[PDB]
Each structure stands twice: as C-alpha cells, then as structure tokens.
C-alpha cells in the first residue's frame, strides 16, 4: 500500500452473498424448481 499499489474492495459484502445463498436454499427446499421459471409454488418435501 506504500508504493502506489492499491487493493480495492469488492462490490458485495459477504453478508449479501450469504443472503443470496440462503434465498436459493429456501427456494429449492420449499418450491422445488418451480421458482426458477415463475412464481414460487409450494409443495411438500416428500413429493418433491
């Protein structure tokens, strides 16, 4: 940092990435794949 050699912060803080991953997990467990095409449709887990 003391020669004109700078590092820069990423755009997303790690909490944001954590939120994204949590959202994906929730989507898969509670809606199968159906959230990846349109509105999130619920369905029990045994039938998924």
């Amino acid at each position: 940092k003391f020669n004109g050699l700078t590092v820069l912060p990423p755009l997303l803080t790690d909490e944001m990435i954590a939120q994204y991953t949590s959202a994906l997990l929730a989507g898969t467990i509670t809606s199968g794949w159906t959230f990846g095409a349109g509105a999130a449709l619920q369905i029990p887990f045994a039938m998924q």
Binding site: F2, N3, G4, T6
Partner: protein, 490 residues
Amino acid sequence: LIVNNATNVVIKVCEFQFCNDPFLGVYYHKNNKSWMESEFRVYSSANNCTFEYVSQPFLMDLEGKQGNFKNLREFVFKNIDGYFKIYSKHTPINLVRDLPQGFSALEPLVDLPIGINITRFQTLLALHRSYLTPGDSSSGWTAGAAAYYVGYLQPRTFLLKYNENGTITDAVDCALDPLSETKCTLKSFTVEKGIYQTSNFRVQPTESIVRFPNITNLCPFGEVFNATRFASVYAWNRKRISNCVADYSVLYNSASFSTFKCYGVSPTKLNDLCFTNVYADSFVIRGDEVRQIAPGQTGKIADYNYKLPDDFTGCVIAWNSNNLDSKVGGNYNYLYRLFRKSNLKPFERDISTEIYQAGSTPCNGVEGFNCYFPLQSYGFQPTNGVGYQPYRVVVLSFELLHAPATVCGPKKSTNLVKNKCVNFNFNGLTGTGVLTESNKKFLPFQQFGRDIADTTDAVRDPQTLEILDITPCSFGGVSVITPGTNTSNQ
C-alpha cells in the same frame, strides 16, 4: 512605446525620460467644430533608439461622442524568448458598464523581435479641452467616458474544439472543477452517467530538517596541498582523513588549479554530502603523464606505477609545480618505474628494485645487456617544455552512504518536528515522511531499520540516540460520480 496617433501607428524602442503623467490633449475649437491633436506630453528626452517602426498614415474621427459604447476591443500581450506578441480582436456591442459573456477568438496580429525586459506598464489616454475646459494644462480639461479591465495570465492546460471552417468556438478549463477534469480526461464535451478516475491527491511536505553530529575540526589540507615536499610517483603517498569539514569552496584563495575534475560526483554538491573514509593520494609527475590519471588509461605511469579502480568515485586535482620542483641542473629527486613483469592492480604500490631481465640470460643482479634497472630519475629544470614540467597531483577517494561516517562538509543542523509530513536528512540519508516515535529495540551497534520493500523505515537520530519511525503520507486515489451531463452538472 506603442502609440496610434491621428495619422500613423508608431512603435518605438528607446530610452525615454517619461513624464510623471504623460498623455494626449486634443483641443475642441467652438468656432470650427473639430478636434485636433495639440498636446502630446510623453517623455522629456529620448537618447538611444534601437528599434523603430511606423505604419501607414490614416484618419480617424477623434470627435467626442455621446452614445453608448459600441466598440469592444480585447488585446493580449506576451513576452517570450525576446518576442513581444500582440493578439487582438474587436466587436460591436451595446453594453456600457457590464462585461459581456461571449465566446470569441483572438487572432494573432503582430509579433516583434524586441528582446527587452518589461516588468511594469502604463496605459495612455487622450484628453478633451475647449472653452468649457477653463484653466491651465493641469486643470483646464475634461475626461470623457471610457472604460477598461485588466487581468493576469497563468500557465494552465485547456481543451479546445475546432469547427469545420477552423475556428475555436469552445474550450474547457482542465483544472477548474472536478466535472471539468472528467471532461478533460475523456476528451469529450459530453459525459454519461457513472463513475470515473481522474488523478491522485498527494499530501505535500512543508518543513525540512537536517540532523548532523558535532564537528569542529578542519581538515589537514595544508599538509596535503601546501606540502613543502612531494614524493616520487612510483612510491605514491597516501593519507587518511576523518572528523573534519571539507570546505572545498575555500580551494580558491590560496591557489589555482591546472585540472580540477570529479567522476561520479558533481562538484557543487560536495558540501551537501557526507562522505566516508576520505583517502588522499599525493605524487608528482610530468605534464605528459597527467593524461594517464583516469580510469581505463594506458602508459607507464598508468601501467607500472599507478592504477585506478574502474568504479572510482572521487576527484582528481592537479596543479603545475614547476617553480618549486625545477632546478637549473635538473631535479633528479623524482624517480619512476619503467619496467615491470606484469601490470599493477588499482590502489597498489610496489617498491621493488630488481634488475629487469629484458629477454633470456637471467641477469642474476648484473644489469648487463638485456638487463635494465626498472627505476629511472626524472630530470626537471626551469628550461623545459610545458609538457615536460613537473606537476603536483592529488587524488581524493571516498565512500558514500554505505556506513557510519564523520566527514559531512559545511552545513547547519536544526530542530526536530513530529507527526507532520516533512523532509529530512539524517547523516546524509534523504527522504520525506511523518516521523513518529518507535517501539523497535535497536542493538547498540546499528543505525537503520529495513523492510521487505527495501526502503528504510526507522532511523536512530544521530543526536538523541532515539529511534524514529518514518510513515509515508497518504496518497490515496480520487474518483468522481456523475449522473450525466444532459441531466445535471452536479
């Protein structure tokens, strides 16, 4: 003087005894309504004139008007490299007191090779006088309305736009406000939404400090430069010098030097640098031999007598010493090697005197045929060629910023400051940066602290024995946010 009288344009360059209040006075006669130039009180005398020029005759009005300002003139005056540059333009306008806002170009009009020094100037007006101006020259006069504005130039950097015909219609000042720096960077009068990088702001150091130990002794040069006697070149003499100031600007009152040259160091800086382990060599040679004292040379002196290392940083001084070392019979005290089996090494001295075997038939100390004595006597007399006369030659060699030293030359030390980006010299080491107290623990035999970055980061102050940490100033970076030119300027 630049003047535009009623008929001609006159450009004079002379020494004038100018009046305190020079001007022009035009009298208006009521009987015949006309304005005629009568008074021109400019200078008392004009002694020596160098350049002159007069333009063609012409006629203007010179009548007093009562309407509004209808002529705007702009002029720019430069003096660069002995050239007086006058750029001009004029425009019809209606504004009387306001200064108009417009974008007009100034076309070059006249350039002259004057080559003089101008540091002040004075404007020159006219006067109007009539029966309504009663009194003498000093009071019997009116003024008449006119106005002007003056401003100063400055070295800057602009961006200019050229239209199809070739005219400058617009420009942007690269250093006015950040949006302008952005337009300057992208080379476009339009900038679209986003972020940009322009430059880097650097904190600037204000003060400077010098930290030097105490030296009072003066160097033993009167027994090096004023030495009653000098030795033979082959047994060249050497001397160690320490703990003194080397005032080489006092090299001139007592004597003057045939040759005074320095390699790897510029002479002017010798006072500001702390040297290490001064060695002073001394000998006497022939003038012809004076061209052998240089790195990468040949000749018997340069081969069998004296040699310099290739990376010899230091100074060569030598002055002719004919009068002291010329004897009418011949100064034979000076002897030199001519024969040697091999070349000598730099900073080596050999005093062997053995019968040189030129070829076969080993001499066995006979000095017979093909057997010669390596040492030969210089014969110096007042009546000899300049290239043969004796010369006293001295070499100064030394180290720089590679070890604790004591020869610093003449300088002055000052106080100490903290926590402010400054500049510093520390026993000849240089640099800029905030100086805070250190928590390191130097051992009592070392004077620095180094990093992976390979730059110093601590220093032991040569006075207080204290340990100071250098922290560089925060250069950082500058970025700018804009919502586009079209939408806004903020």
